[PDB]
Design a protein around this motif. Structure first.
Motif, mmCIF file in Angstrom:
data_model
loop_
_atom_site.group_PDB
_atom_site.id
_atom_site.type_symbol
_atom_site.label_atom_id
_atom_site.label_comp_id
_atom_site.label_asym_id
_atom_site.label_seq_id
_atom_site.Cartn_x
_atom_site.Cartn_y
_atom_site.Cartn_z
ATOM 1 N N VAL A 160 0.827 -1.168 0.000
ATOM 2 C CA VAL A 160 0.000 0.000 0.000
ATOM 3 C C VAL A 160 0.883 1.246 0.000
ATOM 4 C CG1 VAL A 160 -1.775 1.200 1.336
ATOM 5 C CG2 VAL A 160 -2.062 -1.144 0.877
ATOM 6 N N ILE A 213 2.834 4.593 0.618
ATOM 7 C CA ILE A 213 3.581 5.027 1.769
ATOM 8 C C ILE A 213 4.299 6.305 1.404
ATOM 9 C CG2 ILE A 213 3.843 2.683 2.646
ATOM 10 C CD1 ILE A 213 6.732 2.760 1.563
ATOM 11 N N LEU A 237 4.800 11.106 -1.714
ATOM 12 C CA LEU A 237 3.903 9.963 -1.797
ATOM 13 C C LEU A 237 4.507 8.908 -2.752
ATOM 14 C CD1 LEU A 237 0.965 8.717 -1.137
ATOM 15 C CD2 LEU A 237 0.143 10.027 -3.061
ATOM 16 N N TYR A 238 4.886 7.735 -2.235
ATOM 17 C CA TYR A 238 5.220 6.572 -3.057
ATOM 18 C C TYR A 238 3.926 5.742 -3.325
ATOM 19 C CZ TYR A 238 9.348 8.269 -0.628
ATOM 20 O OH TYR A 238 10.296 9.106 -0.075
#
Ligand code: F6P
Ligand code: F6P
Ligand code: F6P
Ligand code: F6P
Ligand code: MG
Ligand code: MG
Ligand code: MG
Ligand code: MG
Ligand code: MG
Ligand code: MG
Ligand code: MG
Ligand code: MG
Ligand code: MG
Ligand code: MG
Ligand code: MG
Ligand code: MG
Lengths: 329, 329, 329, 329
Positions: free
Chosen positions: B124, B126, B160-161
């Motif tokens: 998700v 991360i 935001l990755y």
């Protein structure tokens, strides 16, 4: 590292056992190429101006997005060129695609070319879902050949475009996870023969529909927040993309729900290319997948685009919910 | 395309106006290098065997992960080498890091090197969170210089990755989004001067804590599910990574909540390197950010690792909630 | 590795010493962005259909290629947007480009946006060459400001798109090599303060012009094949791209020649953006660079597009050749 | 583009015609994975500290390099795991590698895992060379099965790590070029059914050996510089890596020479994994490949590591040279 278990190799060896035409390998191998192309366009989608509507509505009423269209052409073309398929069903096409005779193979493939539509623009993880059936009929291939129950599946799984790109693949013997390596563009085995915990601590549902829920879901949710035995309450997670929520459910355990509601007798998720592939993965992983009244994998579809409630996850959590429904029946 | 607005260029031009030492640019420019290195290790984390514990506990009791350690060394080293910083506060270090005299600059930087810990293994999305303050004191630099209210922030934002890698950057004039282009490793401007909708349709909170919630949150959630005017209920989204849930909230609008609960007087999110940077972004975007009783940005911290409730989002939604709290007070 | 010496950092620190406007850093920093974009388009040039003519002739009679045009727009735009330049000279433009007043800085930059044209289609290594001069005049900027001798250079070097992408950078103190890391798109220091061997074993010239060579080159080549002392003969290397042949000459030592011939009084390579930058690198590396009669770096140009013979390399080899010319004079 | 001719697909279709075990596809498909891994390590070799000696000498006296060792392990392992090979010959191993019985297939593969050794450190283009023979014998597999003439080749070609990465593949019907796309890690068809010009304008030889050349090569070179008909002289190119010089020769036409000399009766290039694969490509492209006295492809080897002169290229140029040798015989 100089010895590399790729999805390509792992597949020859498996199906090597049952001596085969090897066209399943050609099929899965073409699907990876489509998956890497989608993974790549998605990683740069705002720079390529790929967020937005395409300007059509699909058969189940979705507002189509540019990425729906790109990922769908990519999947159709690589499936055809594999010489392993005769019927394709996609979320994005009104009818089944019949493959031109020169390129026909023995497989029917149902797929959601890009799942997670509400999550594209905010960069939340999104995916691709597929299920593969052998052709059963002797008749000329038709839409009919896509109308089999999920128990007939020979292969199923999904690609997750998350923080990393993962290909989860379920076949008769089990579930295996392959992670895409961006530097060499291969899918590398990272998790072998995955099994989901007997019981989880997470429940995943869109609670904004509380007013439409049936009394079984309502009671089950209240029980997750107020445990009767005074155990710790479950944590809640709802990413909002089926592929992401199912994937977490597979790895950490727990339960995922998109139930029938007062508004939808059949729920929202689509049987052929969302519910069945996910239920096949779950069952191959030791979990369960049910409408609340019957196993997803036993439903004989009558419409390529039909919907189905789905509740899937660790067997102990999914069973507790089934009991509530039996209790109400 | 042969004309490329990169985060690097956009930053000279902005701070060009107020003629400057230009070390903010050197700072932000070093932070991008750390962000690309983290983005890259995260995209291949299971192939590099980077999921797992490191085997320590941090000051606020988190079970530390290998990626916490890698991303934290990466951020510390690039900040030092920028010659733009004198005090660093990180989630992962008991005390403030004082920069060695040769490398000192005028900025204090608070940061969460990898946010989203529960979401690492399930792929998700991360992130990385940071806030930058100018040194106010004349004294030798100390932990004291990190103890300023969030209103003193000169720059704040996050990486935001997600399905793609985004750098959201807020400064005195507004909020701008830059997307990382994997092929040339630059941050490219995609959204200019972002503003959050006055009102949203999404609420984002972990409902597993229903039993610990105060009566204001409880009423507010019930109102989102059962609207008093019979408008459509809000959808629910909780990805479970602050950076992802705040980012969606910025783009689509709505509300995000991690409130004080019966168990936690101060909530769970950390003031210096989670709450303030997010509240600064929101305010610069036209939204709000409150504990339920006061503005996050006005709190004078007394502890680098202190926690704070936070409720942030579209001004109309955040205001409706504030009213419920006033109604209960 | 979590401590990363990038070309960006290394440049602040160097010019940090002489407190500066820092616009050299902004300049070199913009040139890297152009270099990564070119590196990327070149790695996929046949897939992007980027091989071919553009359909024009440049001032020195070259048949222009699509990649000439792309790499030239890329370099012009990033130079302008750096606010560090006032006059640009490029192989591909008839006249000097004067930068619009808002974007002016104090530097004049001469460059070959893509060198190696004969080698594009066969995938041989190719490059980008540049030299930077400070503006000397007080007059409004003009073509005149590009007409300085190579000894006035403040910075010079080249990008090599070879098996890997290298940025070689020469400044007043020495020569440093940075290798592009494809995964994070930074230039990383790999060779510090490079020095070329006093004497080599390789000679690099296009021997197809034997019939046009002057008697000094002729004797020198015969001496490389038939040593008078019965030492081993030199090996021959001629890649056919100046950037590749000069780079090898820098690393392994030896000599590179593109001499005046009977047909060309001035040789073929171009003084402003091929000969001077290469001669500056060589001299900063401890080597030499001469026409056969005088130092390349002392020539005062009279034409932005003028040509010059060039012989460059290890000082002992270049000196032996100079002696032959003196012997014939 | 959403229809992608990859090397993988193109190979099924070709060998689809002659219904097959399909293990050639598995073989070539495994070789691509090795080629992408090598391409990737080479693009970052100085950052990974991969330049240097390994500290051994191979059977033909080469000073072994770290990259020789990495690329050789990579090729051996992917060949084994393909289940398509029984005997492997590599430049880097004293003897033939016999594949363990479980993994045996019907093919013998000769290969140079990294060609171009003198050019690694200076970033000049380098490569991988291979030839594949079917096993002819019924005996247990042995070194003997690698001792077939080049005319028995079923597949041959090379990877070029140049400005871009190219896979050139020759089979019974012709030669096709595939370019590696770095973003999706597939080999994409760019040149279909390549044919070399009848006559070129380029000659490629290391002229540093002038003193050791036989009188046929000497006369031929003098004729290239001083044409008897007063046509323009040929240009000279010698990159110094066989793969690069042969590749240019294929695309632009001309001639490449590594002749027997006074010092080497057999020249320097190695018959099994340098000369034969290159000669097979050339012949399939309409060119020629000769020692000066006989066709490379007809030599029956007696030693896996034996050397052979080679002269290859456009048929008209290679023929003019053969005539000079006949004239001297
Ligand atoms: O917004 P809702 O009603 O919760 O829908 C979420 C679901 O919709 C989907 O986008 C498919 O339409 C799924 O990926 C996801 O599970
Ligand atoms: O599991 P919980 O209690 O909902 O915590 C979620 C929060 O924790 C964090 O991981 C930080 O610890 C945030 O990124 C996220 O908002
Ligand atoms: O083909 P020629 O005459 O040897 O020219 C080679 C030279 O030409 C260039 O392509 C520039 O035109 C250089 O890169 C190279 O040194
Ligand atoms: O330096 P020399 O003798 O010209 O050798 C060049 C040849 O050597 C090789 O490196 C192989 O050893 C070839 O790639 C190249 O053709
Ligand atoms: Mg849809
Ligand atoms: Mg879907
Ligand atoms: Mg979809
Ligand atoms: Mg933590
Ligand atoms: Mg955090
Ligand atoms: Mg953290
Ligand atoms: Mg030119
Ligand atoms: Mg040039
Ligand atoms: Mg040029
Ligand atoms: Mg060797
Ligand atoms: Mg070789
Ligand atoms: Mg070799």
């Amino acid at each position: 590292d100089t010895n590399i278990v790729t999805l390509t190799r792992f597949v020859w060896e498996e199906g090597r056992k049952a001596r085969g035409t090897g066209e399943m390998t050609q099929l899965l191998n073409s699907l990876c190429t489509a998956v890497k192309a989608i993974s790549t366009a998605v990683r740069k989608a705002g720079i390529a101006h790929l967020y937005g509507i395409a300007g059509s509505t699909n058969v189940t009423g979705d507002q189509v997005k540019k990425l729906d269209v790109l990922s769908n052409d990519l999947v159709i073309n690589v499936l055809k060129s594999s010489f392993a398929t005769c019927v394709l069903v996609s979320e994005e096409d009104k009818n089944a695609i019949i493959v031109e005779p020169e390129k026909r193979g023995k497989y029917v493939v149902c797929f959601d070319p890009l799942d997670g539509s509400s999550n594209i623009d905010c960069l939340v993880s999104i995916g691709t879902i597929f299920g593969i059936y052998r052709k059963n009929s002797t008749d000329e291939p038709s839409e009919k050949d896509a109308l089999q129950p999920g128990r007939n599946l020979v292969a199923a799984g999904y690609a997750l475009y998350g923080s990393a790109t993962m290909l989860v693949l379920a076949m008769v013997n089990g579930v295996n996870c392959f992670m895409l390596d961006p530097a060499i563009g291969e899918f590398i085995l990272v998790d072998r023969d995955v099994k989901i915990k007997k019981k989880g601590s997470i429940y995943s549902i869109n609670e904004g529909y509380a007013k439409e829920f049936d009394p079984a879901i309502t009671e089950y949710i209240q029980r997750k927040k107020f445990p009767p035995d005074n155990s710790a309450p479950y944590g809640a997670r709802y990413v909002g993309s089926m592929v992401a929520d199912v994937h977490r459910t597979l790895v950490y355990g727990g339960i995922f729900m998109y139930p029938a509601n007062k508004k939808s007798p059949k729920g929202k998720l689509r049987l052929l290319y969302e519910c069945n592939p996910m239920a096949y993965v779950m069952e191959k992983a030791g979990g369960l997948a049910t409408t609340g009244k019957e196993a997803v994998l036993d439903i004989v579809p009558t419409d390529i685009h039909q919907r189905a409630p789905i509740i899937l996850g660790s067997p102990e959590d999914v069973t507790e919910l089934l009991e509530i429904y039996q209790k109400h029946a």
